[PDB]
């Protein structure tokens, strides 16, 4: 009912759940920060020099792996942490923890990657992506140069991010949008859709109001953003097909058990 209070509560939760916000990412990417700039990774040599400073060092033991595998393992490290952050955020969405525990799982199973790709755009420009909470920056050209199918994974996300960043959403817009994605009543296998839709109705109302107030000169920003939600699903589909190529062709490339659980029987 109180759409401005819901909006504010979601933003406060977002600030607590996600260490690198869009505001902070954009301050780094435009130099308007007093911390020292990210370490730029543009090739295998810069990767070896920089990886000791990057958070995914926590999981690096063993003989040297080729560059495409290192990137794969470090991105897997980040994806597992991102899932844990999004799950903490989801538990703050009012009504979410009162849903059937099995529907909570289903909402997260089908929603986290759509959310990951949404917020990945906050860390990207057309030429690279911030990693390790802004301590590193990995160039788009370097990620593209990786041998197939590794060099194919990031390009569709950069493409998405350039179009999406053109909406110029901020963190208070994004906090509501990602809640709307999680509360999607049409996920396969949901046991009880009505209470999920009721929550999303309120969230969609809160989002529409937020967008009208925060971006008065963008008419139909709300309509535009809703059309992106559906594009996110195609990104996941294509990503899954790329991971399946890895699974059938590479050796010793099993996924983290959390990522296996999400991907198992996904659609």
């Amino acid at each position: 009912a109180d759409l401005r209070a819901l909006a504010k509560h979601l933003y406060d939760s977002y600030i607590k759940s996600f260490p690198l916000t869009k505001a902070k990412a954009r301050a780094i990417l435009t130099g308007k920060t007093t911390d020292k700039s990210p370490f730029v990774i543009y090739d295998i040599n810069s990767l070896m020099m920089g990886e000791d400073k990057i958070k995914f060092k926590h999981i690096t033991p063993e003989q040297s792996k080729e560059v495409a595998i290192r990137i794969f393992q470090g991105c897997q490290f980040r994806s597992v942490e991102a899932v844990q952050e999004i799950t903490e955020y989801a538990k703050s969405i009012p009504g979410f923890v009162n849903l059937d525990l099995n529907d909570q799982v289903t909402l997260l199973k089908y929603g986290v990657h759509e959310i990951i790709y949404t917020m990945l755009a906050s860390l990207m420009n057309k030429d690279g992506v911030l990693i390790s909470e802004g301590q590193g920056f990995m160039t788009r050209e370097f990620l593209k140069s990786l041998r197939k199918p590794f060099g194919d994974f990031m390009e569709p996300k950069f493409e998405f991010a350039v179009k999406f960043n053109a909406l110029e959403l901020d963190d208070s817009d994004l906090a509501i949008f990602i809640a709307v994605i999680i509360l999607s009543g049409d996920r396969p296998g949901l046991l009880n859709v009505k209470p999920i839709e009721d929550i999303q109705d309120n969230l969609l109302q809160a989002l529409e109001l937020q967008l009208k107030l925060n971006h008065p000169e963008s008419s139909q920003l709300f309509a535009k953003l809703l059309q992106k939600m559906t594009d996110l699903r195609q990104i996941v589909t294509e990503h899954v097909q790329l991971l399946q190529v890895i699974k059938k062709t590479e050796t010793d490339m099993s996924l983290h058990p959390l990522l296996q659980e999400i991907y198992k029987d996904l659609y």
């Binding site: 899932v83 844990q84 799950t87 538990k91 923890v97 525990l101 909570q104 799982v105 997260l108 199973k109 058990p257 959390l258 659980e261 999400i262």
Partner: peptide, 11 residues
């Protein structure tokens, strides 16, 4: 054991 449930039920 579901790991998503573990994250969801964690304090």
């Amino acid at each position: 054991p579901s790991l998503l449930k573990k994250l969801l039920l964690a304090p």
